[PDB]
Symmetry: D2
Subunit: 115 residues, 4 copies
């Protein structure tokens, strides 16, 4: 129900080995760790959560772009890219969070489908 | 060897039923029709060409964004999005041309892999 | 030393009257208010800080995209757009943070000049 | 009535000295030269046309991205970036075409104002 896709706008490739941390806003308004992983050789990260676990809430998907660029050699502008959204508030949906990375820029989109 | 992926930044969905026309620059410097198709329900268009057919050259992938937006109801800025690139000049590669559409904007990227 | 520019990809216009909040990361890892404002008719927000106050550190620029879309009667995906970066003195002097907004997507870049 | 703004997503800067060629679609469906120039130090190109000359029609703005990247010693994907649009009098008066460049990608938007 939650997938992340990351592309590299410099290389024209998937962004591989990108760390991703997901948080969910708690009752007390803190950001609780929810899940985490790394993108694959295809720039994809699946298996973050289950439909049972992925309840309604406000989620933050933090993509560790700095760590990606620095592992490359390369000094980027942003600390990370954070994507924050309400999920599942009209029932369960499947979410793909995509990001396209450059050293001083990124774009992000969502694909939301109703299974 | 040539795939096209189109997303809709307004709806948060694949861009379905988008017409795509591919041209290849000829010896005489004209743009010859090469292939064409429509995106699927997943916003993807496969089956445009074969490795045999997809020789070295300068290719133009014209994504008919205006027709997409107008079929929607909706009056957009651009006539189309054109993606022009040299392909296969270091031997065969697989190319994915992606576009993310809004009424007054688009972004495009390439994913190039060596099979 | 710090400017924000916001554009609207649906209407082909500056994004006007967008709330923007800037925070600086404190020693205890919390985010403290730094500057805020609303974008102008040109989608710009100037006058956020001065050279004196804008010291090296980690800053967050939070753009209230949800309220922007809702005011236009459009349903959006994101709660906000967040741009988090380090200001570094050995780089050029002026930072412009730009964002290009759509309901389910945004783009952001930095223009850092001398 | 027509301005072009080009930014560099790798270096976080204006894209300076980029060649830009503007064409207008002729009655016979060919593209005829209209205006050209090179972006300034601020990544801008002004002075392309006048209100008198910039009549309704289909225009193409071709940004020579390949030469830009090659001059920086970087290998790029695209031959150029093409932006094709109709100018319509019943819309706002001034058109700004912006582009944000990376070696294997670009973004473009229009800001159309009165
Ligand atoms: C879900 O997204 C995908 C899934 C599979 C394959 C894909 O491309 C090969 C994509 C592309 C995503 C994408 C994201 C952003 Br942001 C921009 N700007 C662009 Br252009 C494209
Ligand atoms: C008219 O545009 C401008 C005028 C003055 C200053 C500007 O930034 C400092 C801009 C930004 C343009 C812009 C274009 C794209 Br395409 C994307 N993706 C992004 Br983000 C931003």
């Amino acid at each position: 129900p939650l997938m992340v896709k990351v592309l590299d706008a410099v290389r024209g490739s998937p962004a591989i080995n990108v760390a991703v941390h997901v948080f969910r806003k708690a009752a007390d308004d803190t950001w609780e760790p929810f899940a985490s992983g790394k993108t694959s050789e295809s720039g994809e990260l699946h298996g973050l959560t289950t439909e049972e676990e992925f309840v309604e809430g406000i989620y933050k998907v933090e993509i560790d772009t700095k760590s990606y660029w620095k592992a490359l050699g390369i000094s980027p502008f942003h600390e990370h890219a954070e994507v924050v959204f309400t999920a599942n508030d009209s029932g369960p949906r499947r979410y793909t969070i995509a990001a396209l990375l450059s050293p001083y820029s990124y774009s992000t989109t969502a694909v939301v489908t109703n299974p």
